[PDB]
């Protein structure tokens, strides 16, 4: 075997280059204004004072915040980032093959793992000892060869995040599931419908009739004193979000810790 | 007695030839587009853009999927197929006259039964020992003369499915009950009514009035903001399905296993 | 007996060639825009400002996400893919004929199985020892001849997925049920109905009346301040999805693990 | 196995079909025939109609509605009759039992 040093092919296979984490963008995961507009096919949002359509700056803003919402509704790291953690010694888990659970998951790869004292490395574990479980967020060592805890004894550096899926309809444990993309889209779309619901009719109108010289024109709109113009669409989007979240909260597990 | 080898007249009587399982078709069980159209007597489904009636390809498609639904709402094999199973040794059931429960039922006939080791037959049981209970899905042996389990010791081949009934109003345990046919029909019909419900009026219309020069024409349709055009028929079909399923889930028993 | 090496005819029969996993497509499973459009016979989805029909790219996108959703509502792998797993040693299950449960099911075939240490094979199990249960997702060994657990001792390679069924109305345990196709279709169709429900009528209109020079028209739409134009169809599709999911969650079992 | 048709009016031997089971089977058939017929009483999918032409005016309200089909009432009554008959017949035949 030959490999780039930390990335032992069995225990810590390389999944991404540290150059690519700066090159990946939201558009590479398919989150783009065009996708939102596709879900709003046959609708256009434009300023009634000017006819100007809504700018892609707003779409990208909403998309980035929707990504943040998805990254907090589930205890996951969606976008690749380098994580540096200082973790505590605990006797039970240290005896349990040096078990540590990362704060962020999935793990793309582990970059460094050391035992240290006042920042001095006391030991540097050989990379061939590192065992990584990517979707779980678990790291262990399997060596080839006065108190129960102490603070910040373990120094851990790793890359968290998810890669874009390589094939249609499929994902590896380190690849974003196809439906989490749709969840983020639904979160963005739920905001866009709230914007659009103000512009179907003049402000604050639920009904109008206008008649001139016996020509009569009359409208009942979807607005009402209770429900906004986009009420039904938002309700449906919330149902879809509920189904998607149930599915994804089955894919990622329940959080647990041993006291 | 004389018989074709595996089909001992008492313990494993022959009910079908292995040539016929390729010749049987859905139409031989009476599932046909004409039957569906009979339940939709006095209605026609046609494309309003062309007047073309709906093609029998769609009916046969829906029928085949309705058969699949019926085969999963009940833990049964409707259509004849050859099953090959590798079954585990369990000490209690092996001592209980070599009891095995087939994964699929009814049994039309058992084709082979052997005890084996790495695919080598260790013993081939004489066909005159085989005891079959067809509707239950049970096979036993009644010989004329370090662990509690082991994987895939038993090799079993059999035909599962049901035959079309020979007489009106009657069925043998290996023959399809007359009402399971109607259940499959009701499942198909529930889809056809969902298609038809879109075409009774122009899209999205609940009411119209049109008046020209004092001639007045006015319609209230069965569509509404809540209920679709075929709501009532689907509700009735669901009631009928519920009655049929209760009856058939009394005919086939509750599933049980001994741990 | 003669066979391609890993694929012992009794314990691990070959069901697919590794060339075909690149060639199979959504269309081979009957997921196509036309298969969706068939369920909306007599409707067209059409931009009211241009008359252009919606492009099939959106249909394919929705289908690929609907497959992802179906693969998360049920704990299954639908489309064939090659899985590589490093699995932990557990003493109880290792003693239980080297029992391992795959993360993904069904198993089409096992490609490699080894016990290893830092990537070195410590032993390579003869293929004639491998016992596979495909729909369960179980692998065991039946040999011909200081701690309770250790990480990543077992190396397992296999193909997960389902093949398209070979006969009408029937599936082998490694073949896709006919009703799961209908489930994925219904998931796509729910989204297409959400799109189309905005376009049946002028946006945000619940009632209209126009009177001009002795011609009068009044229309009530299925749109309302509470319900969108396609509410009814979506509700019925959700009922169908619920029935299908109950059936499929009876076909696949409840997940269980021994702690 | 089976039953013979009864030899006297209003009476059955234990091997003869009860008169009410005949009515049960009739009611089961009739429920389906009413489901068919309930689509045809009126133009398909019409709940209300009004027509006015040259001083002739007609308005019709049908038993069809966005909730209920045209034969809903008859089917409901037939289901009540079926329920009564089934209670009676499940008193005539006993509860199933087995010794384990």
């Amino acid at each position: 075997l030959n490999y780039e040093y930390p990335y032992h092919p069995s225990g810590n296979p390389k999944h991404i280059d540290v150059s690519e984490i700066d090159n990946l963008t939201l558009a590479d995961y398919g989150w783009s204004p065009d996708a939102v507009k596709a879900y709003m096919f046959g609708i256009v949002v434009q300023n009634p004072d000017t006819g100007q359509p809504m700018g892609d700056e707003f779409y990208n803003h909403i998309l980035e915040r929707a990504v943040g919402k998805a990254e907090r509704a589930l205890d996951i790291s969606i976008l690749p980032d380098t994580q540096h953690e200082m973790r505590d010694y605990h006797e039970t888990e240290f005896n349990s093959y040096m078990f540590v659970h990362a704060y962020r998951k999935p793990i793309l790869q582990v970059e460094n793992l050391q035992l240290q004292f006042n920042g001095r490395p006391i030991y540097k574990y050989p990379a061939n000892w590192w065992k990584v479980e990517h979707l779980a967020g678990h790291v262990q060592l399997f060596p080839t060869a006065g108190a129960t805890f102490a603070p910040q004894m373990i120094r851990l550096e790793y890359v968290s995040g998810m890669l874009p899926r390589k094939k249609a309809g499929r994902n590896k444990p380190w690849e974003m599931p196809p439906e989490l993309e749709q969840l983020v889209i639904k979160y963005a779309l739920k905001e866009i419908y709230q914007v659009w619901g103000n512009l179907i009719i003049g402000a604050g109108i639920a009904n109008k009739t206008l008649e001139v010289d016996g020509i009569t024109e009359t409208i009942g709109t979807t607005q009402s004193a209770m429900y906004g113009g986009a009420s039904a669409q938002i309700l449906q989007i919330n149902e879809d979000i509920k189904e998607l979240l149930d599915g994804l909260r089955a894919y990622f597990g329940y959080n647990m810790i041993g006291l | 007695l004389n018989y074709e080898y595996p089909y001992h007249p008492s313990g494993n009587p022959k009910h079908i030839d292995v040539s016929e399982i390729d010749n049987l078709t859905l139409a031989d069980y009476g599932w046909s587009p004409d039957a569906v159209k009979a339940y939709m007597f006095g209605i026609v489904v046609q494309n309003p853009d062309t007047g073309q009636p709906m093609g029998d390809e769609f009916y046969n498609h829906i029928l085949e999927r309705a058969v699949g639904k019926a085969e999963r709402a009940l833990d049964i094999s409707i259509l004849p197929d050859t099953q090959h199973e590798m079954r585990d040794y369990h000490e209690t059931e092996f001592n209980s006259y070599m009891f095995v429960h087939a994964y699929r039922k009814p049994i039309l006939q058992v084709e082979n039964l052997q005890l084996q080791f790495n695919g080598r037959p260790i013993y081939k049981y004489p066909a005159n020992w085989w005891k079959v209970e067809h509707l239950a899905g049970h096979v036993q042996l009644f010989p004329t003369a370090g662990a509690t389990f082991a994987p895939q010791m038993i090799r079993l081949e059999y035909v599962s499915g049901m035959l079309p009934r020979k007489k009106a109003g009657r069925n043998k345990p290996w023959e399809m009950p007359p009402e399971l046919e109607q259940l499959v029909i009701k499942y198909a019909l529930k889809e056809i009514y969902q298609v038809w419900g879109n075409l009774i009026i122009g899209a999205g219309i609940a009411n119209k009035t049109l008046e020209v020069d004092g001639i007045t024409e006015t319609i209230g349709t069965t569509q509404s903001a809540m209920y679709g055009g075929a709501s009532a028929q689907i509700l009735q079909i669901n009631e009928d399905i519920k009655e049929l399923l209760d009856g058939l889930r009394a005919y086939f028993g509750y599933n049980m296993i001994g741990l | 007996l003669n066979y391609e090496y890993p694929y012992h005819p009794s314990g691990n029969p070959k069901h697919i060639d590794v060339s075909e996993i690149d060639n199979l497509t959504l269309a081979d499973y009957g997921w196509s825009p036309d298969a969706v459009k068939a369920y909306m016979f007599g409707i067209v989805v059409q931009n009211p400002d241009t008359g252009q029909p919606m492009g099939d790219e959106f249909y394919n996108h929705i289908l690929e996400r609907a497959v992802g959703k179906a693969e998360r509502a049920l704990d299954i792998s639908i489309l064939p893919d090659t899985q590589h797993e490093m699995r932990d040693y557990h003493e109880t299950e290792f003693n239980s004929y080297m029992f391992v449960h795959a993360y993904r099911k069904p198993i089409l075939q096992v490609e490699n199985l080894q016990l290893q240490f830092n990537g070195r094979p410590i032993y390579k199990y003869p293929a004639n020892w491998w016992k596979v249960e495909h729909l369960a997702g179980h692998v065991q060994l039946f040999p011909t001849a200081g701690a309770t657990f250790a990480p990543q001792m077992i190396r397992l390679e296999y193909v997960s997925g389902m093949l398209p069924r070979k006969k009408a109305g029937r599936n082998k345990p490694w073949e896709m049920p006919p009703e799961l196709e209908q489930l994925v279709i219904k998931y796509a169709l729910k989204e297409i109905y959400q799109v189309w429900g905005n376009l049946i009528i002028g946006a945000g209109i619940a009632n209209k009346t126009l009177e001009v020079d002795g011609i009068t028209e009044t229309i009530g739409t299925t749109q309302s301040a509470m319900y969108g134009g396609a509410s009814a169809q979506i509700l019925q599709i959700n009922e169908d999805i619920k029935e299908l999911l109950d059936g499929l969650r009876a076909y696949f079992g409840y997940n269980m693990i021994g702690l | 196995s089976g039953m013979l048709p009864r030899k006297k009016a209003g009476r059955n031997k234990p091997w003869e079909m009860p008169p009410e089971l005949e009515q049960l089977v009739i009611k089961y058939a009739l429920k389906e025939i009413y489901q068919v017929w309930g689509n045809l009483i009126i133009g398909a999918g019409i709940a209300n109609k009004t027509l006015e032409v040259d001083g002739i005016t007609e308005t019709i309200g049908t038993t069809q509605s966005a909730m209920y089909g045209g034969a809903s009432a008859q089917i409901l009554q037939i289901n009540e009759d079926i329920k009564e008959l089934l209670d009676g017949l499940r008193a005539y035949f006993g509860y199933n039992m087995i010794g384990l």
């Binding site: 398919g30 094939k167 249609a168 | - | 790219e57 959106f58 996108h61 690929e64 | 027509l51 002739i56 007609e58």
Partner: peptide
């Protein structure tokens, strides 16, 4: 390979009821 990402119904009088 790559993931896909971006009538007739007539009104008429009942003439028998008109005769009645």
């Amino acid at each position: 390979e790559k993931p896909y990402m971006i009538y007739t119904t007539r009104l008429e009088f009942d003439t028998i009821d008109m005769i009645r």
